[PDB]
Design an enzyme around this catalytic site. Structure first.
Site, short mmCIF file in Angstrom:
data_model
loop_
_atom_site.label_atom_id
_atom_site.label_comp_id
_atom_site.label_asym_id
_atom_site.label_seq_id
_atom_site.Cartn_x
_atom_site.Cartn_y
_atom_site.Cartn_z
N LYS C 26 49.06 33.65 48.97
CA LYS C 26 48.61 34.79 48.19
C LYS C 26 47.19 34.53 47.70
O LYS C 26 46.95 33.54 47.00
CB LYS C 26 49.57 35.03 47.02
CG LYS C 26 49.02 35.86 45.89
CD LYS C 26 49.84 35.69 44.62
CE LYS C 26 50.92 36.75 44.53
NZ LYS C 26 50.74 37.62 43.34
N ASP C 113 57.54 42.53 35.01
CA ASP C 113 57.10 43.20 36.22
C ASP C 113 58.30 43.37 37.16
O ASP C 113 58.14 43.45 38.39
CB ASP C 113 55.91 42.43 36.82
CG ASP C 113 55.60 42.78 38.26
OD1 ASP C 113 55.38 43.97 38.55
OD2 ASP C 113 55.58 41.86 39.10
C1 X3Z Z 1 53.87 35.72 47.90
C2 X3Z Z 1 55.28 35.13 47.93
C3 X3Z Z 1 55.95 35.26 46.56
C4 X3Z Z 1 56.13 35.76 49.03
C5 X3Z Z 1 56.88 35.07 49.97
N1 X3Z Z 1 57.48 35.95 50.75
N2 X3Z Z 1 57.12 37.24 50.33
C6 X3Z Z 1 57.50 38.45 50.83
N3 X3Z Z 1 58.39 38.52 51.98
C7 X3Z Z 1 58.99 39.79 52.35
C8 X3Z Z 1 58.47 40.24 53.72
C9 X3Z Z 1 58.49 39.37 54.80
C10 X3Z Z 1 58.02 39.79 56.03
C11 X3Z Z 1 57.52 41.08 56.19
C12 X3Z Z 1 57.51 41.94 55.11
C13 X3Z Z 1 57.98 41.53 53.87
BR1 X3Z Z 1 57.96 42.74 52.36
C14 X3Z Z 1 57.01 39.60 50.23
C15 X3Z Z 1 56.15 39.46 49.14
N4 X3Z Z 1 55.63 40.65 48.49
C16 X3Z Z 1 54.40 40.60 47.71
C17 X3Z Z 1 53.27 41.19 48.54
O1 X3Z Z 1 53.60 41.04 49.90
C18 X3Z Z 1 54.59 41.44 46.45
O2 X3Z Z 1 53.38 42.07 46.13
C19 X3Z Z 1 55.02 40.54 45.29
O3 X3Z Z 1 56.15 39.82 45.69
N5 X3Z Z 1 55.83 38.26 48.70
C20 X3Z Z 1 56.32 37.14 49.31
#
Ligand code: X3Z
Lengths: 65, 279, 286
Positions: C26, C113
């Site tokens: 991120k 949040d």
């Molecule tokens: C950054 C970290 C915590 C993390 C690890 N995995 N992950 C996923 N995986 C779900 C996914 C997987 C593959 C294709 C689509 C999707 Br949906 C979404 C996500 N969302 C983030 C922005 O993308 C939100 O703003 C806040 O969480 N953050 C993370």
């Protein structure tokens, strides 16, 4: 296969802190500033501040590195 | 919470000897790197410690006159950052004057004391050009400081445990008629505790309790029953003995602390300027 | 660094998230305050239902956070139509969310949040609270918190009235909104403004009285609203059983003090009744 609640058992390495709902009955809240009506309306009570202060007072008191 | 914090897991050490070993290792690593790059220029670890104490005092002075008024928890976090950074780094590689400002900057950020960068640097007793230069240095060193802290930013200070102990004394120790008269002197003792290595060797609750009981002893009030009866240490006498030993060693730490002397400070500062110019 | 980029996952205003070879990264003020907040909070937390921060890096003021990769999120589960949300799956999601929230609140941290896309799911069916960029420590009287927190659809009424000081009630109201979304598969209270959000709240659940919320009129942005009867909850959630209605009513109490905490919700009969929560391995995969 059902769920049975189990309290979070985390070691504080210190004296046991009285439960939040018992702070008023035990007299702790008489020594913390009273929450304003706006505080109560928002959900903030002086019990929270007292509980946090006591938890940090007693945390790790019996701990040796 | 301290009882499962990174401060207890990685930044509370067994003995002063281990801290001395870490500082000596940092000094030796800098010496090795400076000699392997290609003499009385190098500072010895005790001189490094003198300079670090002096610059922690400057950090306290900076945070004290800081407008808007710095919260005491922010100052504690910044001082802890300074101590942790110079546990594993030498004043010759990284100048303490910039590192203390970077520590205060990072502490203000971490402790949610929202202060803009221009008004942060406006507190420096220097002309604006110096303020911009210092701001650039702080921005350069922010990530370095964070890495050297191993990304452990939450610092548990003794102030909230001190307040909790005061609440507990007011509620459950009627022998101590007015615990509040202990605060001032106890606060004083806390400040002296901050000047030693105690923050790296002892839990915040232990530090707060030691300060309170040192204040009580200085006032002539004895509070053995509070430990034994109120704090449940009459069932486990061994734990009470360990607590007493911790407090006594902490008082000895405060007793044997030595403030830096002005002439030695000036000589070491000139030596450090020589090191940073030659490097 | 060690990580080589592989795919692009998502993008927010504060940061952009991409999957890297398997983790997720991120991305004059200095290092971003949101990133520092996430680092400082996730370093002090270790629970199975809270996302873990593996590593961080950057250059000067730039910084990138590294987390374990999560396969899906509750938003994709809810919005998916080929997936059936049985009461067991819903109970499992609520259980994991509430266990993570109980651990978080025990350590005096408000997420602030909470929403379906911030509840991430891995391939093992473990739900984790993520996006701690707005999370804050509560319990200190001398700590003013802004009320802009929580996305509007999940914002508690005390927040909408300008509550500067609050407790776990904001997270629990968000959890109630998430549960309603799980039950209905659509957002419960899709307001388009603060006034619209308050209107939808007071129309679906009835305008709270001075008995349901003793100091309601003392809030900063308090606005007198016309009295709605409120739809009975069993009509909104026809398939829900009485225990589920009890839990929902507890989560949607207007008084934040009376609103059920995470521990209290976990102790409710809804979770201990049969059927039990489905195991994470058998949870639906979109
Ligand atoms: C950054 C970290 C915590 C993390 C690890 N995995 N992950 C996923 N995986 C779900 C996914 C997987 C593959 C294709 C689509 C999707 Br949906 C979404 C996500 N969302 C983030 C922005 O993308 C939100 O703003 C806040 O969480 N953050 C993370």
């Amino acid at each position: 296969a059902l769920y049975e609640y189990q309290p979070l058992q985390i070691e504080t390495y210190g004296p046991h802190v009285p439960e939040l709902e018992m702070l008023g009955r035990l007299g702790y809240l008489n020594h913390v500033r009273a929450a304003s009506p706006q505080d109560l309306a928002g959900g903030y009570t002086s019990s929270l501040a007292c509980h946090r202060a006591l938890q940090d007072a007693f945390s790790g008191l019996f701990w040796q590195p | 919470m301290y009882h499962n914090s990174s401060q207890k897991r990685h930044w509370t050490f067994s003995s002063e000897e281990q801290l001395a070993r870490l500082r000596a290792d940092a000094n030796r690593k800098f010496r090795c790197k400076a000699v392997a790059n290609g003499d009385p220029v190098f500072l010895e670890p005790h001189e490094e410690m003198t300079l670090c104490k002096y610059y922690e005092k400057r950090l306290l002075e900076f945070c004290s006159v800081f407008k808007p008024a710095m919260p005491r928890s922010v100052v504690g976090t910044a001082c802890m950052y300074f101590k942790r950074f110079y546990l594993n780094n030498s004043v010759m590689e990284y100048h303490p004057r910039i590192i203390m400002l970077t520590c205060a900057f990072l502490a203000c950020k971490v402790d949610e004391f929202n202060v803009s960068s221009p008004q942060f640097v406006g507190n420096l007793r220097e002309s604006p050009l110096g303020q911009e230069k210092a701001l650039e240095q702080i921005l350069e060193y922010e990530l370095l400081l964070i890495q050297q802290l191993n990304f452990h930013l939450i610092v548990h200070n003794p102030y909230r445990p001190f307040e909790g102990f005061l609440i507990d004394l007011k509620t459950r120790y009627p022998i101590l008629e007015n615990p509040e008269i202990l605060r001032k002197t106890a606060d004083d003792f806390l400040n002296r505790i901050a000047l030693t290595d105690a923050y790296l060797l002892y839990t915040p609750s232990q530090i707060a309790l030691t300060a309170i009981l040192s204040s009580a002893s200085r006032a002539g009030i004895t509070m053995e029953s509070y430990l034994s009866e109120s704090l449940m240490l009459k069932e486990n006498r061994t734990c009470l003995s360990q607590l007493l030993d911790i407090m006594k060693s902490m008082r000895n730490l405060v007793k044997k602390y030595e403030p830096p002397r002005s002439e030695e400070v000036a000589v070491l500062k000139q030596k450090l300027e020589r090191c940073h110019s030659a490097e | 660094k060690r990580y080589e980029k592989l795919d692009f996952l998502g993008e927010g205003q504060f940061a952009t998230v991409y999957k890297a070879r398997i983790v997720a990264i991120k991305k004059k003020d200095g290092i971003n305050r949101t990133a520092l907040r996430e680092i400082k909070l996730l370093q002090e937390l270790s629970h199975p239902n809270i996302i873990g921060l593996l590593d961080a890096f950057g250059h000067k003021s730039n910084i990138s956070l590294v987390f374990d990769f999560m396969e899906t999120d509750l938003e994709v589960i809810i919005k998916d139509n080929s997936l059936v949300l049985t009461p067991s799956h819903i109970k499992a999601y609520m259980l994991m969310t509430l266990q993570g929230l109980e651990y978080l609140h025990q350590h005096w941290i408000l997420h602030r949040d909470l929403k379906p896309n911030n509840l991430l799911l891995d391939e093992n069916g473990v739900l984790k609270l993520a996006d701690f960029g707005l999370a804050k420590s509560f319990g200190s009287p001398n700590r003013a918190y802004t009320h802009q927190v929580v996305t509007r659809w999940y914002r508690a009424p005390e927040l909408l009235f300008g509550a500067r000081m609050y407790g776990v009630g904001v997270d629990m109201w968000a959890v109630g909104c998430i549960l309603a979304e799980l039950l209905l598969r659509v957002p419960f209270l899709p307001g388009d403004s603060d006034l619209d959000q308050l209107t939808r709240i007071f129309e679906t659940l009835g305008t709270p009285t001075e008995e349901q919320w003793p100091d309601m009129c003392s809030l900063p942005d308090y606005v007198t609203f016309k009295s709605f009867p409120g739809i009975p909850l069993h009509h909104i959630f026809s398939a829900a059983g009485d225990d589920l209605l009890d839990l929902i009513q507890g989560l949607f109490l207007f008084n934040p003090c009376a609103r059920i905490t995470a521990t209290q919700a976990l102790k409710m009969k809804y979770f201990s009744n049969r059927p039990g929560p489905t195991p994470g391995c058998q949870l639906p995969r979109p």
